[PDB]
């Protein structure tokens, strides 16, 4: 109920969709002065400022990143590495964090909702949704996250389908 409204209030201005002949196939992320955007989502950036840049690539970690200018670094997402197990907020409701794995209940999940960040009860991004795999009743996510040392860890289960 109110969780989706809080997601729409937090991700209103900072989330920009990716257009491809009128089709919405992905979402970029503006956090820490960086613009995260995946490889398989191909299209034009809806924002005029973020589209006229050059994104350095990382095909192993499946991420394109760039440098957000200084006049927009204050209006970004927050990020942290301290995460316990339990529940977190996602755009379609809740997501479970168990044994270092993000799980989403079924019914939701198609092609197009790639790049949506995972939020917490405070308002900090803990993961970035990149892919998903159907596991019985409860699907698992293939995402990226950080740690205490500062190494971007990409978690990928078996036989995932890119969204």
């Amino acid at each position: 109920g109110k969780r989706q409204r809080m997601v729409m209030k937090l991700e209103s201005d900072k989330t920009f969709p990716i257009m491809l002949e009128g089709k919405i196939n992905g979402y970029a992320c503006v956090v820490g002065g960086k613009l995260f955007r995946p490889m398989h989502v191909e299209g034009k950036i809806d924002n005029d400022v973020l589209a006229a840049l050059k994104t350095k690539k990382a095909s192993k970690y499946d991420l394109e990143y760039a440098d957000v200018p200084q006049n927009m670094r204050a209006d970004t997402f927050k990020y942290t590495h301290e995460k316990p197990q339990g529940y977190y907020s996602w755009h379609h409701g809740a997501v479970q964090y168990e044994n270092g794995r993000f799980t989403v209940p079924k019914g939701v999940g198609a092609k197009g909702d790639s790049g949506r960040p995972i939020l917490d009860n405070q308002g900090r991004v803990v993961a970035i949704v990149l892919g998903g795999v159907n596991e019985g009743s409860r699907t698992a996510l293939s995402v990226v996250m950080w740690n205490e040392k500062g190494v971007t860890v990409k978690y990928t289960p078996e036989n995932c389908e890119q969204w």
Binding site: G100, M145, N147, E148, K149, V151, V153, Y155
Partner: protein, 49 residues
């Protein structure tokens, strides 16, 4: 006398052949060892996940 293959190699040219043929192998095996150590260091730093 008989014409042995590599009979007149004149040890200086053994040194030039051994340098130009062995230093390349040394550089490529230390590159492969460095690649293996970098892969293990990535798998160590991603362990904290």
């Amino acid at each position: 006398h008989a014409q042995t293959f590599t009979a007149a190699v004149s040890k200086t040219a053994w040194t030039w052949l051994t340098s130009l043929l062995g230093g390349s192998a040394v550089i490529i095996i230390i590159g492969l060892v460095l690649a293996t150590i970098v892969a293990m260091y990535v798998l160590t730093n991603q362990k904290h996940n």
